[PDB]
């Protein structure tokens, strides 16, 4: 046993896939638009998976056969795997409206999202290089298809091709690293790998073959999370695709990759090389994002760059070896995810507006004044303004970084937060104080999208009154590795 | 004196799902 | 292509003469 939570989502995907194709290819049902019927059913398939994974959390480690030769499930994986499904479900909740407006007959598009979640669930628990690569391939492959869903419009398909090549290269680079890592280790399991690589220290103890592999595996992961050293065309992918598909790739693959990153590198590899590369990436991502937030104008692209800047703050936790720092990274991932879902949902709130600049998004003070305050909260959360939940996560990242001793890295993060805040007050000024740009009038959304904002915006502000639970949850996960 | 065939099954299912929710706390 | 495919199903073979078998 022990694979039942993953088995259910794979079975649920197959059952939805058979239901969608048989029904969609039905003259009797007049070839109906299954998407949105596959939806709701798809959202509850994730929710049933969430319950099964949570229910069997003590039972997850049922047998040595699964952990030693296939995948190992641990307390850290369970807490993040629960979050991964919740992140996936939250994205589906905002996405349902997009399915309704679009002529979505793509029942398969939901099955791809569930298949991606199954790949992501296998990715979090993957304990072998073969398993991690195969799981990464499935999650990315499902994602490649979602990017090219709007075939009639070349803008989505061309964006998909750049995402596909970046994905193929990232998987391929990681694969080459596995080959080199395999050559020295003689085994592909992370557990066997850790025994050979424990305290390898490429300066203290010679390890030419292992390092050659480690260099490739680390580089491949960075392309997947849109790290700035390998950001490449990844920011382009975010703006070119419509906002809802962009949201799904924005949070769920990134969270899965970050959780996979901590497991593959901290436990398996012990050299003074892995922490430093993230430290350089963190400084660069925040610097690139801060420059980009001022440089970028389109609201969708700006969100991607703000997300890239936040990704750098997340990277610092791995960069500082302290377990408290790894915990701080987890606090950041959760806050960034809630804000990223909230931010995409506010953009999704202005569904009526076609692609438009920030100035057009302004003038929301007179109309939808509460939404205007809600937009201000979303920008503030990435900005690092103190009352919001993001600052508390950043302060833990910074407090851990000061304890870790990363004064230079910590300072640039504060400086990048400072660089971001000026644009955010300017954006807040744009919303109410100035640049209304025509007094444009917006349209309503579904209750689920409003609740995504309601359950998140209140929580972002409520974090100050009761911040203890999240901090407790995050450290437990870091210690488990 | 009834609604469309199948709507009744869903209405019955909702009560059995809601009964389960109270029951889950109870048992 | 939405062109009408040649469905190879039909009614079973029953030799259909004209009504003038016996008495015109």
């Amino acid at each position: 046993l022990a694979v039942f939570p993953e088995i259910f989502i794979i079975n649920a995907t197959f059952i939805l896939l058979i239901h969608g194709v048989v029904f969609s290819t039905s003259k009797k049902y007049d070839y109906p638009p299954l998407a949105s019927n596959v939806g709701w059913l798809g959202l509850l398939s994730v929710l049933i998976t969430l319950l099964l994974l949570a229910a069997g959390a003590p039972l997850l480690t049922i047998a040595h056969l699964f952990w030693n030769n296939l995948f190992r499930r641990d307390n850290f994986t369970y807490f993040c795997q629960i979050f991964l499904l919740l992140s996936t479900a939250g994205t589906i909740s905002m996405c349902f409206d997009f399915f309704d407006q679009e002529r979505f007959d793509a029942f398969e598009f939901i099955v791809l999202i569930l298949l991606s979640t199954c790949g992501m669930l296998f990715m979090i628990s993957a304990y072998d290089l073969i398993a991690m690569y195969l799981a990464i391939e499935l999650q990315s492959l499902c994602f490649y298809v979602i990017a090219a869903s709007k075939r009639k419009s070349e803008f989505s398909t061309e964006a998909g091709l750049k995402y596909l090549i970046l994905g193929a290269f990232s998987s391929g680079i990681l694969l080459f690293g596995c080959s080199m890592i395999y050559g020295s280790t003689g085994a592909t399991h992370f557990d066997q790998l850790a025994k050979i690589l424990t305290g390898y220290e490429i300066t203290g103890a010679r390890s030419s073959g292992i390092f050659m592999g480690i260099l490739f595996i680390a580089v491949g992961f960075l392309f997947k999370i849109t790290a700035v050293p390998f950001h490449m065309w990844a920011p382009d992918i975010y703006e070119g695709s419509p906002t809802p598909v962009t949201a799904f790739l924005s949070i769920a693959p990134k969270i899965s990759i970050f959780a996979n990153i901590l497991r593959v590198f901290i436990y398996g590899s012990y050299g003074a090389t892995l922490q430093q590369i993230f430290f350089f990436c963190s400084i660069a991502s925040m610097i690139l994002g801060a420059l980009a937030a001022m440089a970028q104008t389109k609201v969708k692209r700006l969100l991607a760059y703000s997300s890239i800047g936040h990704v750098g703050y997340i990277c610092i936790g791995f960069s500082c070896g302290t377990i408290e720092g790894i915990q701080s990274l987890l606090i950041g991932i959760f806050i960034y995810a809630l804000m990223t879902m909230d931010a995409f949902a506010i953009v999704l709130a202005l569904r009526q507006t076609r692609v438009k600049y920030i100035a057009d998004l302004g003038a929301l003070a007179k109309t939808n004044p509460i939404l205007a305050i809600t937009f201000s909260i979303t920008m503030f959360s990435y900005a690092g303004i103190p009352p919001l939940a993001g600052f508390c996560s950043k302060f833990y990242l910074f407090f851990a970084a000061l304890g870790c001793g990363a004064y230079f890295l910590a300072l640039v993060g504060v400086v990048t937060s400072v660089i971001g805040c000026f644009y955010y007050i300017r954006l807040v000024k744009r919303m109410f104080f100035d640049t209304p740009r025509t007094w444009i009038l917006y349209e309503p959304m579904d209750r689920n999208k409003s609740l995504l904002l309601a359950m998140t915006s209140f929580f972002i502000t409520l974090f100050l009154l009761y911040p203890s639970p999240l901090f407790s949850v995050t450290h437990q996960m870091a210690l488990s590795l | 004196v009834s609604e469309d065939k199948n709507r009744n099954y869903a209405v019955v299912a909702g009560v059995v799902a809601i009964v389960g929710s109270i029951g889950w706390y109870l048992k | 292509a939405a062109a009408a495919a040649a469905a190879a199903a039909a009614a079973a073979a029953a030799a259909a003469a004209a009504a003038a078998a016996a008495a015109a």
């Binding site: - | 004196v1 009834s2 609604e3 709507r7 009744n8 209405v11 019955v12 | -």
Partner: protein
């Protein structure tokens, strides 16, 4: 089981009644959204013989003695109280919104003069034809107030908001206007061309307001407008 859930219909009434137990802080909600409005005919002692093709708007309380011709409209919210003196409407006379085609009892000297409006008489919005006869193929102005015994001759448009005093029957083609009864000008022939054009277009436009008389099934079937 379903359909016996009418208990929720009965439960709603308890709360639909809890408005009484909650209208105590001041005398509140004397309105109940009732049903009766003796409006679309409201026959006092004479009945309108309005045609089967003369679209009257369900707001238009065409009281008492009225007659409308084939193709003429009686638009939204226009009372026609033919209660004390006879009224009539020729084929094509589009008595537009908010009209007051209610006639008279008298005004200071007899002057019964049953209002008779000819064909193709495009009457304007908010017009008040209190007690004048109107001739064929003229275009009264939106906001006009046509007082007692003002025979508006043919093809003579009355201006927008143009109050016309008593007995000041305008000539043909003489565009009237002004708060006092004064003429304005003799515009052009294109004026009468557009008068006839607007008259026939308003006739077929009222023939396009057949959705006003649609049935519940047809209203909810139009609610398919979302899909298209």
């Amino acid at each position: 089981r379903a359909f016996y859930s009418v208990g929720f219909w009965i439960r709603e009434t308890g709360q639909a009644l809890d408005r009484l137990g909650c209208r105590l802080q001041g005398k509140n909600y004397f309105r109940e959204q009732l049903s009766r409005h003796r409006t679309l005919m409201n026959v006092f002692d004479k009945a309108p013989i309005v045609d089967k093709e003369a679209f009257v708007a369900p707001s238009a309380s065409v009281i008492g003695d009225v007659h409308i011709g084939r193709g003429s409209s009686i638009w939204y919210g226009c009372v026609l109280r033919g209660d004390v003196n006879t009224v009539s409407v020729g084929s094509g006379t589009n008595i537009q919104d908010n009209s007051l085609v209610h006639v008279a009892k008298s005004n200071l000297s007899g002057k019964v003069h049953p209002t008779i409006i000819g064909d193709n008489v495009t009457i304007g919005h908010s017009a008040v034809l209190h007690g004048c006869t109107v001739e064929d193929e003229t275009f009264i102005g939106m906001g006009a107030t046509l007082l007692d015994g003002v025979v508006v001759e043919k093809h003579g448009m009355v201006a927008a908001g143009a109050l016309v005093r008593q007995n000041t029957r305008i000539p043909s083609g003489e565009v009237w206007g002004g708060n006092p009864a004064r003429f304005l000008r003799k515009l052009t022939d294109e004026e009468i061309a557009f008068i006839s054009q607007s008259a026939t277009n308003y006739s077929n436009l009222a023939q396009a307001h057949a959705a006003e008389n649609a049935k519940p099934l047809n209203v909810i079937e139009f609610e398919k407008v979302l899909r298209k």
